[PDB]
Amino acid sequence: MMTTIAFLGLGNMGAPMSANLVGAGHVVRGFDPAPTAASGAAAHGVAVFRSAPEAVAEADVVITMLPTGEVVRRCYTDVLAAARPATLFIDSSTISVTDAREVHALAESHGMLQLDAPVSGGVKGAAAATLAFMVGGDESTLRRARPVLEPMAGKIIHCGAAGAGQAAKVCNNMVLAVQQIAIAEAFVLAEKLGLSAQSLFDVITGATGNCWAVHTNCPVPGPVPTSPANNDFKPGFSTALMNKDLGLAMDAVAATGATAPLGSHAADIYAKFAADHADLDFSAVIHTLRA
Amino acid sequence: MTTIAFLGLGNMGAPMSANLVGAGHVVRGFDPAPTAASGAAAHGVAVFRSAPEAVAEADVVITMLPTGEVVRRCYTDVLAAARPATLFIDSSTISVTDAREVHALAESHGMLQLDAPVSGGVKGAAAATLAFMVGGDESTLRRARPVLEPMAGKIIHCGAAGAGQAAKVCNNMVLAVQQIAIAEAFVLAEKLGLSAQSLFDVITGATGNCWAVHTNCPVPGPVPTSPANNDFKPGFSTALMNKDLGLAMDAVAATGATAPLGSHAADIYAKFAADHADLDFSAVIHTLRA
Ligand SMILES: C[C@@H](CCC(=O)O)C(=O)O
Ligand SMILES: C[C@@H](CCC(=O)O)C(=O)O
């Protein structure tokens, strides 16, 4: 299983992910253009390089954890020629399904194996190695990748061909967004009807409406003391991050001509909420329903 | 032996009253439809020509009626015929406003009263697995418990009068939103080239999981028992979901609440019910391009 891994993107996700790879005994060759990110990763054993091409030159596997499809595209353009032939590229960035398929084809045109493997779990999942990887690409390529993913992962799920990882994540998170708004509406309506928060909680969680947005992320303080509502709506899952994912869902809706009325409505709601509350947990959208 | 007047012997009322007979109660009935009455009499209910007659000898009076207006008119018709401290249980699904009005009216005559609307449908009614969501006094629920038990899989005290109705309407508004949201996810997935089984496996193991997908999956295959595999036979009909959402919209209006997605869901299902009232509510997956 021991492998030389180039890790491009050493931010809030990339840094802890890379540390777990070092802990598992891999040689990790890192690059990030932010020197503070690079320094922090070096402190936990990443060999940091001056450029992304240098980092990938001697690597069996190249992982990208980057903010957008544009940055992934630009990164692949900078490094693919530098990589040894038939190197495994894993993009664990969260990007559009369109961009994922573009960068996948580019990697394959350079003779590289490529997977999309975006993750859920956030920074906390990243530190604890409990992230869920949602993978698109060839099954044999995933087989080759498993030893590298396992030390970062709680779950690895194969979603289909290239882009299917991005697709699965973005579909789930659109539903989540809609559910978190709907649970918030339910709690505020209950409050105006004189139905207690604890009572509504007990019913919804015992009934057909139950979902993570209530049972774990309860947007009123009290029924779930661990939920962000009890900690000033500190993330958790920030509004900024949810808004990014909803943007990607709206990109997917636009590329496909799909009709997603509530998903699109939830996107508009989170886009407005992100303008001034980007730093709050996405459950804090409940504030928009009170007045 | 507690004697129970059951007013409303329709699709729900008939099987509920059969379970009460089966539990050893004396059941007195009224319904304006001769077929409903006859069918109930056939399983042991002593049917009377008028609601006031049914109520005369009753320790408990149960209503299962279509609207608040009918519930209200039934109460003013029968309250004077009832014995003092009779226990009235309305298991109709009506507005929280109407529920609290009829509760107040009944207690004004020295009656004890609960709202106890139900989830489970006709299937649940027959099988005695209904979920009663109850508003009223804890001590009144305790007295009612022996009567509710033979009809029920769950009995949940929701709070003071009207809280049963509120709890049910709030859950069903969330459910409608979830059922549409899951449908959108499956349609988007298909157009992205992500298989239904793959999306199913991901969502059910992730934060988006809910009954609308894990049990009511609106595409055939991943859950062989879901209505999608059986021509969208209810299940839970669009007609009934539409009725609940209408009540949610009455509650949103009465309170001045902000419920944008619930309201959007209500609009979608009202429109869908014009064409497909008889299909399971999960069938909404095929009306999104309208
Ligand atoms: C074994 C596991 C990866 C290892 C971990 O739990 O960190 C998996 O996702 O299959
Ligand atoms: C609903 C009740 C069970 C009564 C019964 O159905 O026999 C309970 O479990 O609380």
Curated annotation (Swiss-Prot), chain A:
Enzyme type, top EC level: oxidoreductase
Reactions performed catalytically: 3-hydroxy-2-methylpropanoate + NAD(+) = 2-methyl-3-oxopropanoate + NADH + H(+)
Pathway this chain belongs to: Amino-acid degradation; L-valine degradation
InterPro entries: 3-OH-isobutyrate_DH-rel_CS (IPR002204), 6-PGluconate_DH-like_C_sf (IPR008927), 6PGD_dom2 (IPR013328), 6PGDH_NADP-bd (IPR006115), HIBADH (IPR011548), HIBADH-like_NADP-bd (IPR029154), HIBADH-related (IPR015815), NAD(P)-bd_dom_sf (IPR036291)
EC number: 1.1.1.31
One Pfam family of this chain: NAD_binding_11
Molecular function (Gene Ontology), one example: 3-hydroxyisobutyrate dehydrogenase activity
Superkingdom, natural source: Bacteria
Keywords: Branched-chain amino acid catabolism, NAD, Oxidoreductase
Catalytic site positions: 169
Annotated NAD(+) binding sites: 4-32, 94, 244
GO BP terms in the entry: valine catabolic process
PANTHER family per UniProt: 3-HYDROXYISOBUTYRATE DEHYDROGENASE, MITOCHONDRIAL (PTHR22981:SF7), 3-HYDROXYISOBUTYRATE DEHYDROGENASE-RELATED (PTHR22981)
Similarity field: Belongs to the HIBADH-related family.
Name of this chain's protein: Probable 3-hydroxyisobutyrate dehydrogenase
Source organism of this protein record: Mycobacterium tuberculosis (strain ATCC 25618 / H37Rv)
